[PDB]
Design a protein around this ligand. Sequence first.
Ligand SMILES: CCCCCCCCCCCCCCCCCC(=O)OCC(COC(=O)CCCCCCCCCCCCCCCCC)OC(=O)CCCCCCCCCCCCCCCCC
Ligand code: HEA
Ligand code: HEA
Ligand SMILES: CCCCC/C=C\C/C=C\C/C=C\C/C=C\CCCC(=O)O[C@H](COC(=O)CCCCCCCCCCCCCCCCC)COP(=O)(O)OCCN
Ligand SMILES: CCCCC/C=C/C/C=C/CCCCCCCC(=O)O[C@H](COC(=O)CCCCCCCCCCCCCCC)COP(=O)(O)OCC[N+](C)(C)C
Ligand SMILES: CCCCCC/C=C/CCCCCCCCCC(=O)O[C@H](COC(=O)CCCCCCCCCCCCCCC)COP(=O)(O)OC[C@@H](O)CO
Ligand SMILES: CCCCCC/C=C/CCCCCCCCCC(=O)O[C@H](COC(=O)CCCCCCCCCCCCCCC)COP(=O)(O)OC[C@@H](O)CO
Ligand SMILES: CCCCCC/C=C\CCCCCCCCCC(=O)O[C@H](COC(=O)CCCCCCCCCCCCCCC)COP(=O)(O)OC[C@@H](O)CO
Ligand SMILES: CCCCCCCCCCO[C@@H]1O[C@H](CO)[C@@H](O[C@H]2O[C@H](CO)[C@@H](O)[C@H](O)[C@H]2O)[C@H](O)[C@H]1O
Ligand SMILES: CCCCCCCCCCO[C@@H]1O[C@H](CO)[C@@H](O[C@H]2O[C@H](CO)[C@@H](O)[C@H](O)[C@H]2O)[C@H](O)[C@H]1O
Ligand SMILES: C[C@H](CCC(=O)O)[C@H]1CC[C@H]2[C@@H]3[C@H](O)C[C@@H]4C[C@H](O)CC[C@]4(C)[C@H]3C[C@H](O)[C@]12C
Ligand SMILES: C[C@H](CCC(=O)O)[C@H]1CC[C@H]2[C@@H]3[C@H](O)C[C@@H]4C[C@H](O)CC[C@]4(C)[C@H]3C[C@H](O)[C@]12C
Ligand SMILES: C[C@H](CCC(=O)O)[C@H]1CC[C@H]2[C@@H]3[C@H](O)C[C@@H]4C[C@H](O)CC[C@]4(C)[C@H]3C[C@H](O)[C@]12C
Ligand code: CUA
Ligand SMILES: [Cu+2]
Ligand SMILES: [Mg+2]
Ligand code: NA
Ligand code: NA
Ligand SMILES: [Zn+2]
Lengths: 227, 105, 58, 259, 98, 46, 514, 84
Amino acid sequence: MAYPMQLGFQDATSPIMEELLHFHDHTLMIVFLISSLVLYIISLMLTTKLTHTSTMDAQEVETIWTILPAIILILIALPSLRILYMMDEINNPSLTVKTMGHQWYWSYEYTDYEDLSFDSYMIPTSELKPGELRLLEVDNRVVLPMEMTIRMLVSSEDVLHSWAVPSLGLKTDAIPGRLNQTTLMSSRPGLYYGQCSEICGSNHSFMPIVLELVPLKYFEKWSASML
Amino acid sequence: HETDEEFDARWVTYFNKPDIDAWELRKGMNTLVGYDLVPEPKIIDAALRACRRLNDFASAVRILEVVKDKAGPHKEIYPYVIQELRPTLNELGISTPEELGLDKV
Amino acid sequence: FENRVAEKQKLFQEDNGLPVHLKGGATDNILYRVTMTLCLGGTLYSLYCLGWASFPHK
Amino acid sequence: HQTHAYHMVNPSPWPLTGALSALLMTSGLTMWFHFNSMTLLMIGLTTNMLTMYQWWRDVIRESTFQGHHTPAVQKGLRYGMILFIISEVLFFTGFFWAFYHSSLAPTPELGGCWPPTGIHPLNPLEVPLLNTSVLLASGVSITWAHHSLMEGDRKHMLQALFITITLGVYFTLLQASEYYEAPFTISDGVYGSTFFVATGFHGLHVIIGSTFLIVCFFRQLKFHFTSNHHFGFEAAAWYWHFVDVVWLFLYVSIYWWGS
Amino acid sequence: ASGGGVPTDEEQATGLEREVMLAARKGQDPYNILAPKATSGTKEDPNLVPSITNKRIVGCICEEDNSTVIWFWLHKGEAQRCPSCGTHYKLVPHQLAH
Amino acid sequence: HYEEGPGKNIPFSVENKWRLLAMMTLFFGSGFAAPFFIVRHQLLKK
Amino acid sequence: MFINRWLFSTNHKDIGTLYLLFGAWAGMVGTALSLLIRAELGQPGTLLGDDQIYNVVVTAHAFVMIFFMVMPIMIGGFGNWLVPLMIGAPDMAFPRMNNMSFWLLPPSFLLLLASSMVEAGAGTGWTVYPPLAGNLAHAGASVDLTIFSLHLAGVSSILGAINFITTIINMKPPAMSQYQTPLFVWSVMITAVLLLLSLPVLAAGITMLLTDRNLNTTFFDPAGGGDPILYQHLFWFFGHPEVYILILPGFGMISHIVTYYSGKKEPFGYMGMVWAMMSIGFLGFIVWAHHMFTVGMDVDTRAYFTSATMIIAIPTGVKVFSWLATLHGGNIKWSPAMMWALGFIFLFTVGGLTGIVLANSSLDIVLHDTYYVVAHFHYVLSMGAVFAIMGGFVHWFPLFSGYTLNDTWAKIHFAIMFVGVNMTFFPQHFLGLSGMPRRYSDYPDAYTMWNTISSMGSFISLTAVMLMVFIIWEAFASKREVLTVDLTTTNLEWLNGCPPPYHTFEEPTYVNLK
Amino acid sequence: ASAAKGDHGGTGARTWRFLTFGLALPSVALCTLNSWLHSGHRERPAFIPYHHLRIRTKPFSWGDGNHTFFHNPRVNPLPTGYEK
Ligand SMILES: CCCCCCCCCCCCCCCCCC(=O)OCC(COC(=O)CCCCCCCCCCCCCCCCC)OC(=O)CCCCCCCCCCCCCCCCC
Ligand code: HEA
Ligand code: HEA
Ligand SMILES: CCCCC/C=C\C/C=C\C/C=C\C/C=C\CCCC(=O)O[C@H](COC(=O)CCCCCCCCCCCCCCCCC)COP(=O)(O)OCCN
Ligand SMILES: CCCCC/C=C/C/C=C/CCCCCCCC(=O)O[C@H](COC(=O)CCCCCCCCCCCCCCC)COP(=O)(O)OCC[N+](C)(C)C
Ligand SMILES: CCCCCC/C=C/CCCCCCCCCC(=O)O[C@H](COC(=O)CCCCCCCCCCCCCCC)COP(=O)(O)OC[C@@H](O)CO
Ligand SMILES: CCCCCC/C=C/CCCCCCCCCC(=O)O[C@H](COC(=O)CCCCCCCCCCCCCCC)COP(=O)(O)OC[C@@H](O)CO
Ligand SMILES: CCCCCC/C=C\CCCCCCCCCC(=O)O[C@H](COC(=O)CCCCCCCCCCCCCCC)COP(=O)(O)OC[C@@H](O)CO
Ligand SMILES: CCCCCCCCCCO[C@@H]1O[C@H](CO)[C@@H](O[C@H]2O[C@H](CO)[C@@H](O)[C@H](O)[C@H]2O)[C@H](O)[C@H]1O
Ligand SMILES: CCCCCCCCCCO[C@@H]1O[C@H](CO)[C@@H](O[C@H]2O[C@H](CO)[C@@H](O)[C@H](O)[C@H]2O)[C@H](O)[C@H]1O
Ligand SMILES: C[C@H](CCC(=O)O)[C@H]1CC[C@H]2[C@@H]3[C@H](O)C[C@@H]4C[C@H](O)CC[C@]4(C)[C@H]3C[C@H](O)[C@]12C
Ligand SMILES: C[C@H](CCC(=O)O)[C@H]1CC[C@H]2[C@@H]3[C@H](O)C[C@@H]4C[C@H](O)CC[C@]4(C)[C@H]3C[C@H](O)[C@]12C
Ligand SMILES: C[C@H](CCC(=O)O)[C@H]1CC[C@H]2[C@@H]3[C@H](O)C[C@@H]4C[C@H](O)CC[C@]4(C)[C@H]3C[C@H](O)[C@]12C
Ligand code: CUA
Ligand SMILES: [Cu+2]
Ligand SMILES: [Mg+2]
Ligand code: NA
Ligand code: NA
Ligand SMILES: [Zn+2]
């Protein structure tokens, strides 16, 4: 989850989110350098009494400021696309979970073997147990096995929603009539939080996602206790 | 393009035209100060002498000001120019902007 | 039919200071007043309807 | 007094009455869809027709009767009409896009096929083919009208333009009968939606185009056009060829490929 | 197999359209439809700028394909020079009628 | 013809600066106030 | 006379003034909406109501700022005032149709205000996506009034585009080629081509939404075989060109301002600036799906749109460096307009660069629908489009009015605004990176500090807006009448005095061909 | 290209009238004949209340709300089937 005064991404919980952090670091360095160079050159143009106001020839210098940005774009696009394609890589999941958005809560279906389903509602601030998080807790968490490749299928039963978990690098829109797929893999146990990410009406702000990542044996015990 | 020598000569020739008129004097100085250079003393010399043929003392003073101005922070250009122009300044009776106090606010 | 364009050219070039939309004569003023009356009255009416629709009506 | 060739237009009320007519038609549609009343909409339609009538009347006054359409002014109006037709092409492009989007990827609600289960399309070799011959034929007859006008031939210009209008009306009546006879409706899913909204906007443009040709016909009867100066006729022919080309794309896309 | 009955411009054009048509027939350009051809632009051979009044704006394109146009008011009387490149212009006032 | 020149090419008067201040205040203030009153209307409805 | 002049106008300057007044009033509306947004978010919890009333405010804020403030000011106001003057033309090609482009906008705005007064408003986002915007989740007239509002605004801009293209191509002096027209005129022509091609597609899309809501069509409704994602494609096919429409006239004014206050007769690299604007306009049509990287498109499609979006940085960077090269060697005049333009160059660059971060579909998974996007587009809009507008307004106000502003007050105004916008939007990068969604009326507690700072920044900008109104009052109150303006030899629009006569170029300029 | 014929010796009104009467209107006459033959009412198909057809998310703004604008009783069933 985010923490007070945070500046950057939530800590990466999946290998792909780590890839994105390293890619963002690379790209932000370029953003800082270019923005700073422009600021510097502005100050450089503005701080001399020397003048040159006759016609200036532009051809030579425009090679520089077309080829250099073209190279920089390629040095961004190359790692960007590599990550894009590694996200799409065939992975062979061991478990499929569906989630359906609604106004305003999520439901989950685990139907690989048993027909398990349930709803998942935000805890109202007035019902929070002490130390629990305002607008983020849910009554029924998405219990999931850690260190395993999971297929999440996302759809909606009414308007658009979007199913997001920032520390895993996940955001998949929830569109009625459409079954969108993404892959989920947590390197660690714990609780991982997200929020509905497509404006869906009155309580868009108040239909969060909470994953609960536990060892496989514990996941299996949980599934079995749902029978 | 033209060398420094060719550029200087064309400008000396321009200002030395005997019947240069007031419009041409101004067009020449105003064009010249658009380049990335402080004009050579031989160019200034010819322009000051054009001022004299045009009985225009004030523009002679102005030309000295714009030479100083074009040097920006390079403070030893103007004293060198004035050093090189000193005979002409004397011959023609041109007072410098400093000598006229026009360098003070 | 016969070609009466010259008569209309004379009519519409007459130096009477009228703007082109009134230069046809009195029928133009009529048609204009009808048009503008319906537009302004309809607009007022549309404002009244907004007023109506802006509140719950039992 | 000017020494350029351009047209300084008299101050005019019609921009304002046209803008207000748009307010009345849209608030009118709102009142019709949601508050069960046609009153505002009827007012807006009336003021729209009055606005268009008086505005284009004035353009006729300014040009045929007052001489303000110099070659420069006419060149501007040529550009303006072409640009206007371009914007209309892109409008139709949006409805073709919707048509191909739905028909190339038919969803499970349809039966996962196209046409959808339960949809029985018109035969494109029947009235839709006749319609195609009608509009292609009118493109031939309007071209005859255009050459007759340029050659100074009043009688044959009128005959050819009358034939063109008659074919446009025939298309419109054929399409009205096909609408009534169609066994599917605008509410029959995305098949009905794309079919009636795309051909319906096309039908409206046929009516607009025919109306424009009819204006030209009566202006021709009144000797407004010269053999060299007749931009209202040129613009209505370009618009008519646009309507004919949109039909051909509809026919191949929705009626033929889409059946 | 044909016929007539369509007015020509010569018969029916009116107003400014007709003025432009008639002037074009005489090879005159009172309504500034054409770009004038420049002279050498020297003081002896200045560009001659017609005007219905006593001053008119001139735009001077100093070298071919310059994208920058230099604009100035040209006044009646002694020829003036383009501020950028010095080419001379002289106003020739005249009524519109030729 | 119409009036020309500074203060004459505008649909509002600048003849009196205090009358002008009132006009500009009603003009810009009405635009700035409207959303506050619309929000009030919606909160008051139900 | 008053009605003839101001309701029946056929004059490009008077219609430009009407557009500037309209857009200034719309700017007040849109500022108020922005303050309500930031008041809701200024402390954790709920201030006004739930997300519905909140997102009616968000939705209205965006439509007012884009359709009633930026486009009427840039294209309707500066375009109509300046374009005919800059090419020596006596008016626009269609001076009467020009007046209907203006008069369609008060009805358009009226329809938008009606949508927010009836039922519970259109709390849809300015994107108006179904099914939330459809007749089950937004039953009643609000969304339909919003659609009609856009129809009228669209017709206004399509006809204005036809007018500008025709005027610019057809009404230059006969000797002037297109490569001798000023960059602002280029920027308006290219903007007009983008409007001409993009607005009809939006009109098609929102008409289909209208018929899905009222005529039982199912273009966007899976129950009939329709697809909510088709609406998104049609909307963004217009909506990405739309942001270049929002900035291109600003690029053109920046070019003129930077040239003028550098003391130069011409911008650096003129043909390069024309190339860059035409390239941006063209590329602006083939990138729209970077607004849809999380909807579930195929990976190859995401790869294409990533790559094509980033290409635009190259012509845009040419313009940035060419503005810098225009400053180079200048005798710089530190006027208030110059300050706005210099702030534009830097702040637009920052926003453009975070645009390039977002172009990466992989990283955009995490950044989409967060405040990182909000930060990107308010740097290019609140500190790019608006800064160009303010710089153009301060620079040309003496031409339009005949009166000078107080430069010291205008510099104060710039300084306040500069602090306010950066305090408002810079912390929104942190909020986005750390995961705060868009279109939220309240946020988990961790996000409090930056939302607090951002809301405080929005009040500083309000103080600048109030000050602007006072500054305009003071100029009309004091009536310092313009005498002389420098650089008229390369700024034709000034050469008929301030304000220019009602009719200008009755006798056209003389330009020969040689 | 692909057809035949073969004028283009000089385009004019006479040629376009020749095309109008000799090719275009005969085409229309032939297609009118063809259409006049394959007319005649087909048997209507059994009603099946498919959920992707006869959509009603809001009543139509005319009539009883449940009839399309050019409703044909013979061939357009209501959501509940053909009328009497
Ligand atoms: C840029 C627009 C002008 C903005 C003006 C306001 C902002 C100041 C300029 C800002 C000073 C310039 C340097 C950026 C500072 C960002 C702080 C940071 O550590 O960034 C961290 C990252 C994420 O990084 C991490 O994973 C955290 C690891 C390190 C954390 C260490 C903890 C303590 C560090 C203390 C930093 C506190 C910062 C609080 C900052 C609170 C801000 C209100 O966040 C981000 O990406 C946010 C960036 C969004 C992309 C836009 C960059 C464009 C501006 C660059 C040119 C400025 C020129 C000077 C500026 C010239 C002005 C004329
Ligand atoms: C003026 C308005 C404007 C402009 C000009 C732009 C310009 C750009 N925008 Fe953006 N954008 C918006 C307004 C604008 N945008 C709006 C309103 C939205 C949100 C819509 C909504 O959802 O409501 C949005 C959303 C948006 C998104 C979707 C993000 C998401 O929803 O998840 C993306 C993604 O690619 C994007 C990218 C860009 C890029 C790459 C540019 C480029 O054109 C920027 C190019 C400029 C530069 C790169 C800087 C100058 C260059 C140099 C100094 C050269 C050197 C640089 C390099 C080598 C990189 N924009
Ligand atoms: C041009 C466009 C524009 C501009 C200028 C602004 C200006 C501002 N916007 Fe805007 N905003 C949008 C376009 C714009 N915004 C869009 C498209 C959205 C997304 C909508 C959606 O999600 O659907 C958005 C969303 C948005 C949000 C996110 C809401 C959410 O996700 O819940 C926020 C939150 O802080 C915000 C705040 C502000 C603030 C504080 C300003 C302030 O900086 C404003 C301060 C004042 C001014 C900049 C001056 C106003 C101008 C004038 C007075 C003109 C004067 C006239 C003359 C000189 C002639 N905006
Ligand atoms: C040649 C014959 C056809 C001629 C054209 C007929 C009318 C078309 C008019 C315009 C088309 C525009 C709106 C399209 C709406 C649908 C009309 C489609 C054409 C039509 O008429 O479709 C009919 C439905 O009409 C209906 O719903 C009701 C239609 C009446 C209400 C229309 C209200 C909507 C208006 C929206 C206008 C938006 C304009 C946007 C312009 C923006 C520009 C930038 C089909 O009849 P049916 O009974 O369902 O099936 C037949 C079964 N026997
Ligand atoms: C992410 C990407 C980042 C990219 C950053 C790129 C930075 C690029 C910077 C490099 C610029 C190098 C340009 C060099 C051109 C110099 C030509 C010249 O030097 O100027 C002259 C011609 O100028 C002329 O038309 C032209 C005169 C000089 C103007 C040349 C272009 C000016 C460029 C200004 C750039 C400002 C900053 C831009 C943004 C980085 C030739 O001068 P000479 O003394 O020989 O004779 C003249 C004097 N006599 C009289 C004594 C003969
Ligand atoms: C049952 C009935 C329903 C009717 C519904 C209403 C719809 C009908 C609108 C039909 C359009 C009629 C347009 C008539 C224009 C007449 C004015 C005209 O044609 O004006 C001509 C100029 O053209 C010009 O402005 C060119 C003007 C161009 C006009 C183009 C109009 C297209 C309008 C489409 C509008 C809706 C678009 C659809 C949106 C969904 C005048 O110049 P000339 O012809 O050279 O004459 C001069 C010579 O005489 C001199 O020798
Ligand atoms: C100017 C033109 C105006 C328009 C006139 C109408 C023209 C129509 C051309 C349509 C061609 C595409 C039709 C595709 C539809 C599928 C047909 C198909 O796929 O048919 C196959 C051959 O297709 C084929 O189109 C072969 C396709 C090529 C055939 C070309 C025939 C006409 C050629 C004219 C060329 C003129 C020159 C053009 C250049 C200017 C044959 O196999 P089936 O018939 O399946 O039989 C199997 C069953 O019996 C049992 O299971
Ligand atoms: C849901 C409903 C929403 C919309 C409601 C309707 C909104 C608008 C109400 C419109 C009423 C239109 C009234 C008639 C307008 C005639 C305009 C016209 O004809 O404009 C002409 C120029 O545009 C030209 O040619 C070429 C262009 C002609 C345009 C004709 C009008 C089209 C209006 C709608 C177009 C919509 C866009 C279509 C594509 C999506 C003439 O220009 P003027 O400046 O007048 O004169 C110049 C003089 O020299 C003439 O002698
Ligand atoms: C001068 C320029 C133009 C200005 C025109 C001003 C027009 C004012 C007419 C007012 O008449 C109203 O019409 C409503 C509709 O418009 C009626 O609602 C009625 O309309 C429906 C449809 O016919 C019925 O369903 C309802 O029973 C019924 O409330 C209502 O009774 C009546 O007060
Ligand atoms: C400023 C420019 C804005 C232009 C935008 C349009 C805004 C118009 C909003 C009007 O809002 C209404 O004001 C009434 C005020 O009279 C309120 O009535 C309320 O207040 C009344 C007066 O105190 C009571 O008598 C009523 O019972 C009570 O419902 C009503 O709820 C509210 O909808
Ligand atoms: C050829 C054309 C116009 C030149 C003129 O007639 O003045 C010029 C103007 C801008 C130029 C382009 C821009 O300067 C941007 C690019 C610069 C690179 O150095 C070459 C390709 C590049 C894409 C240029 C190609 C070409 O020289 C362009 C397109
Ligand atoms: C009246 C006019 C004669 C030319 C003239 O007025 O001098 C003639 C010439 C062409 C005639 C029209 C054309 O022949 C085309 C049409 C022929 C049909 O019989 C219907 C009337 C129709 C529309 C004719 C009406 C009328 O007899 C027209 C209009
Ligand atoms: C997004 C749009 C389809 C919208 C639709 O669903 O309605 C589609 C239609 C054609 C597509 C393009 C064409 O298939 C050609 C290219 C194919 C590549 O694999 C991706 C890029 C590529 C350029 C495609 C991008 C995108 O998927 C496009 C542009
Ligand atoms: Cu569900 Cu937002
Ligand atoms: Cu975009
Ligand atoms: Mg989204
Ligand atoms: Na013709
Ligand atoms: Na809040
Ligand atoms: Zn010159």
